[PDB]
Protein backbone atom coordinates (compact mmCIF):
# COMPACT_ATOMS: atom_id res chain seq x y z
CA UNK A 1 0.00 0.00 0.00
CA UNK A 2 1.50 3.42 0.82
CA UNK A 3 5.09 3.79 1.77
CA UNK A 4 5.54 6.26 4.59
CA UNK A 5 8.88 8.01 4.63
CA UNK A 6 10.67 9.60 7.55
CA UNK A 7 14.19 11.12 7.71
CA UNK A 8 16.54 8.45 9.04
CA UNK A 9 18.53 10.53 11.50
CA UNK A 10 18.55 14.10 12.82
CA UNK A 11 20.90 15.73 15.43
CA UNK A 12 20.14 18.82 17.56
CA UNK A 13 21.39 20.44 20.84
CA UNK A 14 19.46 20.91 24.16
CA UNK A 15 17.18 23.91 23.92
CA UNK A 16 16.98 23.89 20.13
CA UNK A 17 13.85 23.26 18.04
CA UNK A 18 13.77 20.27 15.62
CA UNK A 19 11.03 19.16 13.15
CA UNK A 20 10.60 15.60 11.93
CA UNK A 21 8.35 14.88 8.86
CA UNK A 22 6.23 11.95 7.68
CA UNK A 23 5.09 11.74 4.10
CA UNK A 24 3.16 9.20 1.95
CA UNK A 25 3.57 7.73 -1.54
CA UNK A 26 -0.18 8.43 -2.20
CA UNK A 27 0.39 12.15 -2.21
CA UNK A 28 -0.61 14.45 0.61
CA UNK A 29 -1.11 13.43 4.23
CA UNK A 30 -4.60 14.68 5.29
CA UNK A 31 -6.46 14.79 8.65
CA UNK A 32 -8.27 11.54 7.83
CA UNK A 33 -4.85 9.85 7.93
CA UNK A 34 -4.86 10.51 11.71
CA UNK A 35 -1.05 10.86 11.87
CA UNK A 36 0.40 9.28 14.96
CA UNK A 37 3.88 9.69 16.49
CA UNK A 38 5.41 7.30 19.10
CA UNK A 39 8.82 7.23 20.76
CA UNK A 40 11.09 4.22 21.28
CA UNK A 41 13.64 4.35 24.05
CA UNK A 42 16.06 1.46 25.00
CA UNK A 43 14.81 -1.87 26.08
CA UNK A 44 11.63 -1.72 24.08
CA UNK A 45 10.14 1.15 25.99
CA UNK A 46 7.52 2.85 23.81
CA UNK A 47 5.49 5.91 24.54
CA UNK A 48 2.64 7.29 22.46
CA UNK A 49 3.29 11.03 21.88
CA UNK A 50 0.78 12.40 19.32
CA UNK A 51 -2.49 10.92 18.09
CA UNK A 52 -4.95 12.23 15.49
CA UNK A 53 -2.46 14.56 13.84
CA UNK A 54 -2.02 16.86 16.88
CA UNK A 55 -3.36 15.56 20.18
CA UNK A 56 -0.68 15.01 22.84
CA UNK A 57 -1.15 11.64 24.57
CA UNK A 58 -1.67 11.75 28.40
CA UNK A 59 1.28 13.25 30.22
CA UNK A 60 3.39 14.02 27.17
CA UNK A 61 5.40 17.34 27.56
CA UNK A 62 4.00 20.43 25.91
CA UNK A 63 7.27 20.87 23.95
CA UNK A 64 6.08 18.11 21.63
CA UNK A 65 3.48 19.25 19.08
CA UNK A 66 2.20 17.60 15.84
CA UNK A 67 0.76 19.44 12.78
CA UNK A 68 0.37 19.01 9.01
CA UNK A 69 3.04 21.23 7.40
CA UNK A 70 1.89 21.40 3.85
CA UNK A 71 1.53 17.92 2.52
CA UNK A 72 3.32 16.19 5.38
CA UNK A 73 2.69 15.42 8.98
CA UNK A 74 5.40 16.79 11.29
CA UNK A 75 6.47 16.54 14.88
CA UNK A 76 8.23 19.64 16.26
CA UNK A 77 10.07 19.46 19.56
CA UNK A 78 10.41 23.07 20.68
CA UNK A 79 13.30 23.14 23.11
CA UNK A 80 14.72 19.60 22.92
CA UNK A 81 15.93 17.86 26.14
CA UNK A 82 18.75 15.21 26.38
CA UNK A 83 16.15 12.62 27.32
CA UNK A 84 14.40 13.09 23.93
CA UNK A 85 17.24 11.21 22.23
CA UNK A 86 15.26 8.22 20.85
CA UNK A 87 13.66 6.82 17.69
CA UNK A 88 10.38 8.38 16.59
CA UNK A 89 7.99 6.45 14.34
CA UNK A 90 5.07 7.99 12.55
CA UNK A 91 2.16 5.93 11.25
CA UNK A 92 -0.71 6.85 8.97
CA UNK A 93 -4.25 5.30 8.89
CA UNK A 94 -4.60 4.51 5.24
CA UNK A 95 -7.15 2.15 3.63
CA UNK A 96 -7.95 0.72 7.00
CA UNK A 97 -4.31 -0.16 7.81
CA UNK A 98 -1.87 1.69 10.08
CA UNK A 99 1.25 2.06 7.89
CA UNK A 100 4.54 2.84 9.65
CA UNK A 101 7.39 5.02 8.49
CA UNK A 102 10.92 3.75 9.01
CA UNK A 103 11.63 5.72 12.20
CA UNK A 104 13.92 8.74 12.71
CA UNK A 105 16.85 8.32 15.17
CA UNK A 106 17.12 11.70 16.94
CA UNK A 107 20.37 12.55 18.66
CA UNK A 108 20.03 15.41 21.20
CA UNK A 109 23.70 16.17 22.08
CA UNK A 110 23.85 15.95 25.85
CA UNK A 111 27.62 15.36 25.89
CA UNK A 112 30.49 15.98 23.38
CA UNK A 113 30.84 13.76 20.41
CA UNK A 114 33.24 10.86 20.89
CA UNK A 115 35.07 8.74 18.33
CA UNK A 116 34.98 4.91 18.53
CA UNK A 117 37.61 2.80 20.22
CA UNK A 118 37.96 -0.11 17.77
CA UNK A 119 39.71 -3.33 18.86
CA UNK A 120 40.13 -6.25 16.42
CA UNK A 121 41.00 -9.65 17.89
CA UNK A 122 42.43 -12.61 15.86
CA UNK A 123 40.85 -16.19 16.11
CA UNK A 124 41.96 -18.05 19.24
CA UNK A 125 44.00 -21.33 18.67
CA UNK A 126 41.32 -23.26 20.50
CA UNK A 127 38.72 -22.16 17.98
CA UNK A 128 41.17 -22.84 15.03
CA UNK A 129 41.33 -26.46 16.22
CA UNK A 130 37.58 -26.79 15.37
CA UNK A 131 38.27 -25.79 11.73
CA UNK A 132 36.65 -22.34 12.30
CA UNK A 133 37.96 -18.82 12.59
CA UNK A 134 36.03 -15.78 13.93
CA UNK A 135 37.53 -12.33 13.89
CA UNK A 136 35.91 -10.01 16.44
CA UNK A 137 35.83 -6.20 16.04
CA UNK A 138 34.55 -4.38 19.19
CA UNK A 139 33.57 -0.71 18.78
CA UNK A 140 32.87 1.31 21.95
CA UNK A 141 32.49 4.81 23.26
CA UNK A 142 31.12 6.55 20.15
CA UNK A 143 28.67 9.41 20.24
CA UNK A 144 26.43 10.08 18.19
CA UNK A 145 25.42 6.38 18.13
CA UNK A 146 25.55 5.84 14.36
CA UNK A 147 28.52 3.97 12.82
CA UNK A 148 29.17 1.88 9.62
CA UNK A 149 31.46 -1.16 9.75
CA UNK A 150 33.30 -2.55 6.67
CA UNK A 151 35.61 -5.59 6.52
CA UNK A 152 38.46 -6.12 4.07
CA UNK A 153 40.36 -9.29 3.51
CA UNK A 154 43.50 -8.58 1.51
CA UNK A 155 41.97 -5.37 0.28
CA UNK A 156 38.87 -6.96 -1.27
CA UNK A 157 35.54 -5.84 0.34
CA UNK A 158 33.79 -8.58 2.31
CA UNK A 159 30.10 -8.82 1.78
CA UNK A 160 29.43 -12.42 2.86
CA UNK A 161 29.97 -13.89 6.33
CA UNK A 162 29.90 -10.89 8.67
CA UNK A 163 27.42 -10.01 11.38
CA UNK A 164 27.24 -6.56 13.08
CA UNK A 165 25.07 -5.68 16.07
CA UNK A 166 22.92 -2.56 16.24
CA UNK A 167 24.47 0.15 18.55
CA UNK A 168 23.73 -0.35 22.28
CA UNK A 169 23.68 2.63 24.64
CA UNK A 170 26.39 2.19 27.26
CA UNK A 171 25.92 3.16 30.90
CA UNK A 172 27.81 6.41 30.30
CA UNK A 173 25.42 6.96 27.34
CA UNK A 174 27.90 6.65 24.60
CA UNK A 175 27.27 3.62 22.32
CA UNK A 176 28.90 0.25 21.57
CA UNK A 177 28.60 -2.40 18.73
CA UNK A 178 30.57 -5.49 17.61
CA UNK A 179 31.07 -7.11 14.23
CA UNK A 180 32.18 -10.70 13.52
CA UNK A 181 33.82 -12.13 10.40
CA UNK A 182 33.56 -15.93 10.51
CA UNK A 183 35.67 -18.06 8.15
CA UNK A 184 36.75 -21.69 7.96
CA UNK A 185 40.38 -22.15 9.11
CA UNK A 186 41.22 -23.13 5.49
CA UNK A 187 39.92 -19.78 4.26
CA UNK A 188 41.78 -18.03 7.10
CA UNK A 189 44.94 -19.67 5.94
CA UNK A 190 44.59 -18.30 2.35
CA UNK A 191 44.74 -14.59 3.32
CA UNK A 192 47.13 -12.38 5.24
CA UNK A 193 45.72 -8.93 6.07
CA UNK A 194 42.29 -8.51 7.67
CA UNK A 195 40.75 -5.07 8.39
CA UNK A 196 37.79 -3.78 10.32
CA UNK A 197 36.93 -0.25 9.17
CA UNK A 198 34.55 1.88 11.14
CA UNK A 199 33.24 5.21 9.86
CA UNK A 200 31.77 7.55 12.49
CA UNK A 201 30.74 11.14 11.56
CA UNK A 202 32.54 11.07 8.18
CA UNK A 203 35.87 9.80 9.57
CA UNK A 204 37.20 6.26 9.36
CA UNK A 205 39.10 4.33 12.01
CA UNK A 206 40.73 1.13 10.64
CA UNK A 207 42.21 -1.77 12.58
CA UNK A 208 44.09 -4.45 10.60
CA UNK A 209 46.07 -7.55 11.45
CA UNK A 210 48.13 -9.98 9.48
CA UNK A 211 47.99 -13.76 9.90
CA UNK A 212 51.58 -14.20 11.15
Amino acid sequence: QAVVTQESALTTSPGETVTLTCRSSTGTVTSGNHANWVQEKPDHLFTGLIGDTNNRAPGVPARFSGSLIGDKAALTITGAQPEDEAIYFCALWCNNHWIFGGGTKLTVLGQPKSSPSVTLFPPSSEELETNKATLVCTITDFYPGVVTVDWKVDGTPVTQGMETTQPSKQSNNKYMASSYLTLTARAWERHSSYSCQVTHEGHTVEKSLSRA
Binding site: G48, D52, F89, G103, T134, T138, E163
Partner: protein, 211 residues
Amino acid sequence: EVQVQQSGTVLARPGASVKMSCKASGYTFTNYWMHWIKQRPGQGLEWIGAIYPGNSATFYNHKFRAKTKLTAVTSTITAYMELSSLTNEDSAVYYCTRGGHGYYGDYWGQGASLTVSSAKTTPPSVYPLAPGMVTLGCLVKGYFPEPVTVTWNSGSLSSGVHTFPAVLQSDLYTLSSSVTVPSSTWPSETVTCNVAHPASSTKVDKKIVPR
Protein backbone atom coordinates in the same frame (compact mmCIF):
# COMPACT_ATOMS: atom_id res chain seq x y z
CA GLU B 1 -2.67 3.99 36.54
CA VAL B 2 -3.34 2.55 33.00
CA GLN B 3 -1.23 -0.60 32.60
CA VAL B 4 -1.14 -3.09 29.75
CA GLN B 5 0.31 -6.34 31.10
CA GLN B 6 1.69 -8.84 28.52
CA SER B 7 2.61 -12.49 28.76
CA GLY B 8 6.22 -13.66 28.79
CA THR B 9 8.79 -14.97 26.37
CA VAL B 10 7.85 -17.88 24.06
CA LEU B 11 10.00 -20.36 22.32
CA ALA B 12 8.25 -22.32 19.58
CA ARG B 13 9.19 -24.72 16.77
CA PRO B 14 8.28 -24.21 13.06
CA GLY B 15 4.67 -25.28 12.21
CA ALA B 16 3.25 -24.68 15.67
CA SER B 17 0.74 -22.16 16.95
CA VAL B 18 1.05 -19.90 20.10
CA LYS B 19 -1.43 -17.77 21.97
CA MET B 20 -0.27 -14.48 23.58
CA SER B 21 -2.35 -12.21 25.79
CA CYS B 22 -2.69 -8.66 27.14
CA LYS B 23 -4.51 -7.78 30.30
CA ALA B 24 -5.77 -4.21 30.73
CA SER B 25 -5.53 -2.31 34.03
CA GLY B 26 -6.70 1.22 34.96
CA TYR B 27 -9.53 1.86 32.36
CA THR B 28 -12.77 0.62 30.77
CA PHE B 29 -11.61 -2.14 28.39
CA THR B 30 -14.88 -2.05 26.46
CA ASN B 31 -14.42 1.56 25.35
CA TYR B 32 -10.99 1.10 23.76
CA TRP B 33 -9.38 -0.80 20.91
CA MET B 34 -6.54 -3.18 21.53
CA HIS B 35 -4.01 -3.18 18.68
CA TRP B 36 -1.15 -5.65 18.16
CA ILE B 37 2.25 -4.56 16.72
CA LYS B 38 5.10 -6.80 15.46
CA GLN B 39 8.68 -5.46 15.69
CA ARG B 40 11.35 -7.44 13.85
CA PRO B 41 15.01 -6.85 14.85
CA GLY B 42 15.62 -4.78 11.77
CA GLN B 43 12.52 -4.64 9.74
CA GLY B 44 10.66 -1.89 11.63
CA LEU B 45 7.19 -2.03 13.11
CA GLU B 46 4.15 -3.69 11.48
CA TRP B 47 0.55 -3.39 12.48
CA ILE B 48 -1.19 -6.82 12.80
CA GLY B 49 -4.77 -5.74 13.57
CA ALA B 50 -7.05 -4.42 16.26
CA ILE B 51 -10.03 -5.64 18.26
CA TYR B 52 -12.76 -3.56 19.92
CA PRO B 53 -13.81 -5.74 22.94
CA GLY B 54 -17.11 -3.90 23.60
CA ASN B 55 -18.59 -5.32 20.38
CA SER B 56 -15.74 -7.57 19.20
CA ALA B 57 -15.19 -5.74 15.89
CA THR B 58 -11.74 -6.37 14.32
CA PHE B 59 -9.53 -4.88 11.60
CA TYR B 60 -6.70 -7.02 10.23
CA ASN B 61 -3.74 -6.22 8.13
CA HIS B 62 -4.32 -8.30 4.90
CA LYS B 63 -0.82 -9.74 5.23
CA PHE B 64 -1.65 -11.15 8.70
CA ARG B 65 -5.20 -12.27 8.04
CA ALA B 66 -4.01 -15.89 7.40
CA LYS B 67 -1.75 -15.84 10.48
CA THR B 68 -3.59 -14.13 13.30
CA LYS B 69 -6.73 -14.49 15.25
CA LEU B 70 -7.52 -11.78 17.75
CA THR B 71 -10.03 -12.36 20.56
CA ALA B 72 -10.78 -10.67 23.92
CA VAL B 73 -12.58 -11.89 27.06
CA THR B 74 -14.35 -8.95 28.64
CA SER B 75 -14.92 -10.65 32.04
CA THR B 76 -11.17 -11.29 32.29
CA ILE B 77 -10.16 -8.01 30.57
CA THR B 78 -7.78 -9.95 28.41
CA ALA B 79 -7.12 -9.74 24.66
CA TYR B 80 -5.39 -12.69 22.90
CA MET B 81 -3.67 -13.14 19.63
CA GLU B 82 -3.08 -16.66 18.31
CA LEU B 83 -0.46 -17.09 15.57
CA SER B 84 -0.55 -20.26 13.53
CA SER B 85 1.95 -22.12 11.28
CA LEU B 86 4.94 -20.40 12.65
CA THR B 87 7.98 -19.79 10.44
CA ASN B 88 11.28 -18.12 11.37
CA GLU B 89 9.85 -14.90 9.98
CA ASP B 90 7.44 -14.75 12.90
CA SER B 91 10.30 -14.37 15.44
CA ALA B 92 9.82 -10.80 16.69
CA VAL B 93 8.72 -8.83 19.76
CA TYR B 94 4.92 -8.33 19.81
CA TYR B 95 3.28 -5.42 21.62
CA CYS B 96 -0.35 -4.80 22.42
CA THR B 97 -1.30 -1.11 22.56
CA ARG B 98 -4.45 0.77 23.59
CA GLY B 99 -6.22 2.78 20.93
CA GLY B 100 -9.17 5.02 20.49
CA HIS B 101 -10.33 7.55 17.92
CA GLY B 102 -7.62 8.56 15.54
CA TYR B 103 -4.90 6.62 17.38
CA TYR B 104 -3.62 3.11 17.94
CA GLY B 105 -1.34 3.31 20.99
CA ASP B 106 -1.13 5.94 23.70
CA TYR B 107 -0.18 3.24 26.22
CA TRP B 108 2.04 0.27 25.21
CA GLY B 109 2.65 -3.11 26.77
CA GLN B 110 6.20 -4.22 27.44
CA GLY B 111 6.54 -6.64 24.52
CA ALA B 112 6.66 -10.45 24.39
CA SER B 113 9.46 -12.03 22.49
CA LEU B 114 8.68 -15.00 20.28
CA THR B 115 11.54 -17.08 18.87
CA VAL B 116 10.73 -19.80 16.29
CA SER B 117 13.60 -22.18 15.90
CA SER B 118 14.23 -25.81 15.12
CA ALA B 119 17.39 -25.74 17.22
CA LYS B 120 17.98 -27.70 20.40
CA THR B 121 19.52 -26.49 23.66
CA THR B 122 23.22 -26.15 22.96
CA PRO B 123 25.90 -25.00 25.43
CA PRO B 124 28.36 -22.21 24.43
CA SER B 125 31.94 -22.75 23.39
CA VAL B 126 33.88 -20.01 25.23
CA TYR B 127 37.05 -18.74 23.58
CA PRO B 128 39.53 -16.30 25.19
CA LEU B 129 40.45 -13.20 23.14
CA ALA B 130 43.92 -11.92 23.95
CA PRO B 131 45.75 -9.18 21.99
CA GLY B 132 48.84 -11.11 22.54
CA MET B 133 45.60 -0.09 28.62
CA VAL B 134 44.70 -3.49 27.21
CA THR B 135 41.37 -4.93 26.15
CA LEU B 136 40.71 -8.62 26.66
CA GLY B 137 37.58 -10.42 25.41
CA CYS B 138 35.63 -13.66 25.54
CA LEU B 139 33.69 -15.05 22.59
CA VAL B 140 30.62 -17.12 23.66
CA LYS B 141 29.83 -18.99 20.50
CA GLY B 142 27.00 -21.28 19.37
CA TYR B 143 24.48 -21.51 22.26
CA PHE B 144 20.71 -21.90 22.22
CA PRO B 145 18.51 -20.51 23.72
CA GLU B 146 19.18 -17.02 25.04
CA PRO B 147 20.48 -15.89 27.63
CA VAL B 148 24.04 -16.34 28.83
CA THR B 149 25.46 -14.25 31.69
CA VAL B 150 29.09 -13.07 31.58
CA THR B 151 31.02 -11.76 34.57
CA TRP B 152 34.71 -11.04 34.86
CA ASN B 153 36.67 -12.36 37.77
CA SER B 154 33.54 -13.52 39.50
CA GLY B 155 32.08 -10.02 39.38
CA SER B 156 35.10 -8.23 40.84
CA LEU B 157 35.96 -6.67 37.48
CA SER B 158 32.94 -4.50 36.75
CA SER B 159 34.37 -1.31 35.37
CA GLY B 160 35.30 -1.16 31.71
CA VAL B 161 33.25 -4.28 30.89
CA HIS B 162 31.12 -4.33 27.67
CA THR B 163 28.92 -7.33 26.84
CA PHE B 164 27.52 -6.96 23.33
CA PRO B 165 24.10 -8.21 22.12
CA ALA B 166 23.95 -11.67 20.67
CA VAL B 167 23.79 -12.18 16.92
CA LEU B 168 22.31 -15.31 15.36
CA GLN B 169 24.90 -17.23 13.26
CA SER B 170 23.25 -20.32 11.84
CA ASP B 171 20.51 -21.06 14.40
CA LEU B 172 22.78 -20.46 17.35
CA TYR B 173 23.72 -17.26 19.11
CA THR B 174 27.13 -15.71 19.48
CA LEU B 175 27.92 -12.86 21.84
CA SER B 176 31.21 -11.40 23.14
CA SER B 177 32.30 -9.36 26.18
CA SER B 178 35.40 -7.22 26.66
CA VAL B 179 37.08 -5.76 29.75
CA THR B 180 39.76 -3.04 29.48
CA VAL B 181 42.39 -3.10 32.26
CA PRO B 182 45.62 -1.01 32.85
CA SER B 183 48.48 -2.62 30.94
CA SER B 184 50.53 -3.08 34.11
CA THR B 185 47.72 -5.17 35.54
CA TRP B 186 48.01 -7.91 32.95
CA PRO B 187 49.35 -10.60 33.07
CA SER B 188 50.33 -10.05 36.75
CA GLU B 189 46.67 -9.91 37.82
CA THR B 190 44.76 -12.84 36.36
CA VAL B 191 41.68 -12.02 34.31
CA THR B 192 39.05 -14.79 33.88
CA CYS B 193 35.61 -14.47 32.15
CA ASN B 194 32.81 -16.53 33.74
CA VAL B 195 30.00 -17.72 31.42
CA ALA B 196 26.77 -19.24 32.65
CA HIS B 197 24.19 -20.67 30.30
CA PRO B 198 21.29 -21.62 32.68
CA ALA B 199 19.25 -23.58 30.03
CA SER B 200 21.96 -26.26 29.92
CA SER B 201 23.37 -25.49 33.40
CA THR B 202 26.71 -24.64 31.83
CA LYS B 203 29.14 -22.64 33.95
CA VAL B 204 32.64 -22.21 32.42
CA ASP B 205 35.57 -20.01 33.31
CA LYS B 206 38.21 -18.88 30.83
CA LYS B 207 41.52 -17.33 31.98
CA ILE B 208 42.85 -14.95 29.33
CA VAL B 209 46.47 -16.01 28.68
CA PRO B 210 48.86 -13.84 26.56
CA ARG B 211 49.67 -15.02 23.06
